[PDB]
Design a protein around this ligand. Structure first.
Ligand SMILES: CSc1ccc([N+](=O)[O-])cc1
Length: 162
């Protein structure tokens, strides 16, 4: 297991434009295209991302290329964020993957309300962190995925993904 395999499980792979759990146009391995309700706007974003006229369909190699870029950018963003860097740097590699997973799903703004969870994680209060993480819109809207990510933070193992 690693962040790539973990997100591939949580996000799936679809080669045609689809709507994510929030109803937003997406492609590949959970690559958010736009929050615009315009399918034409999403198609434009897709074309821009891939560098060709895709007509709303991409290949597996193309999906994987976007995915690698997205994981990389998620990490680089974390390292540039004064609220996230300290916690990320304090974590072991397995729990780092859990952090990247959350940022990938919700974005940095999406994780702004997690200040108290973040402190518990930095403190290595794992069971307490796990309890606090579940007190969230995230947990309620995507409970199965949230439970896997939370288990990963609680245990520092890949048990939830085996
Ligand atoms: C509870 S959300 C979150 C976001 C980032 C990190 N991080 O260590 O970069 C951890 C948790």
């Amino acid at each position: 297991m690693n962040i790539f395999e973990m997100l591939r499980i949580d996000e799936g792979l679809r080669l045609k434009i689809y709507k994510d759990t929030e109803g937003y146009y997406t492609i590949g391995i959970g690559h958010l295209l736009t929050k615009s309700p315009s399918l034409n706007a999403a198609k434009s974003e897709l074309d821009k991302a891939i560098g060709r006229n895709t007509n709303g369909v991409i290949t597996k190699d193309e999906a994987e290329k976007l995915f690698n870029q997205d994981v990389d950018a998620a990490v680089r963003g974390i390292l540039r964020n004064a609220k996230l860097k300290p916690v990320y740097d304090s974590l072991d590699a397995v729990r780092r993957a859990a952090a990247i997973n959350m940022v990938f799903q919700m974005g940095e703004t999406g994780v702004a309300g997690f200040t108290n969870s973040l402190r518990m994680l930095q403190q290595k209060r794992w069971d307490e962190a796990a309890v606090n993480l579940a007190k969230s819109r995230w947990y309620n809207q995507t409970p199965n995925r949230a439970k896997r990510v939370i288990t990963t933070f609680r245990t520092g193992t890949w048990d939830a993904y085996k």
